[PDB]
Amino acid sequence: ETLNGALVNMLKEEGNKALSVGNIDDALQYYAAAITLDKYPHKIKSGAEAKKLPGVGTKIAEKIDEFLATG
Questions:
Q1: Which among 10, 20, 50, 65 is least buried, having the fewest CB atoms inside 10 angstroms?
Q2: In the annotation, is 45 catalytic?
Q3: Contact 16, 34 (CB under 8 A)
Q4: Helix (H) or strand (E) holding 63
Q5: CATH code assigned at 40
Q6: Measured between alpha carbons, how far is residue 28 from residues 1, 14, 16, 33, 53 in Å?
Q7: Which residues contact residue 49 at a Cβ distance below 8 angstroms, ignoring those fewer than 6 apart?
Q8: Counting Cβ atoms within 10 Å, is residue 47 exposed (0-12), middle (13-18) or buried (19+)?
């Protein structure tokens, strides 16, 4: 329902990928960013803005940019 829910799902996929490589710390980081993005009350137009939120990293912002590039 949340405007960013689609991106949140993609973040969950990224978290699983990090787990697949044994990078549990990164996976947890993605999950934290996903929760914050959900709590945020507005659709985000770019990942760069997303970085402002606690738990969002540069890599996560880039994923957001890519998703926007896809549609």
A1: 20
A2: no
A3: no
A4: helix 58-70
A5: 1.10.150.110
A6: 23, 10, 9, 9, 16
A7: none
A8: buried
Angle at 27 between CA 12 and CA 17, to 5 degrees: 65
Question: How many domains does the chain fold into?
Answer: 1
The residues, any chain, with a CB within 8 Å of residue 40's CB and separated by 6 or more, are 4, 53
Alpha-carbon distances of 46 from 12, 24, 56, rounded to whole Å: 18, 26, 12
Question: Residue 45 belongs to what domain range?
Answer: 1-71
Residue type for position 71 = G
Of these residues, 17, 45, 52, 63, which one is catalytic? 63
Q: How was it solved?
A: NMR
52 touches 64 (CB < 8 A): no
How is residue 66 written in tokens? 């890519």
What single-letter amino acid sits at 68? L
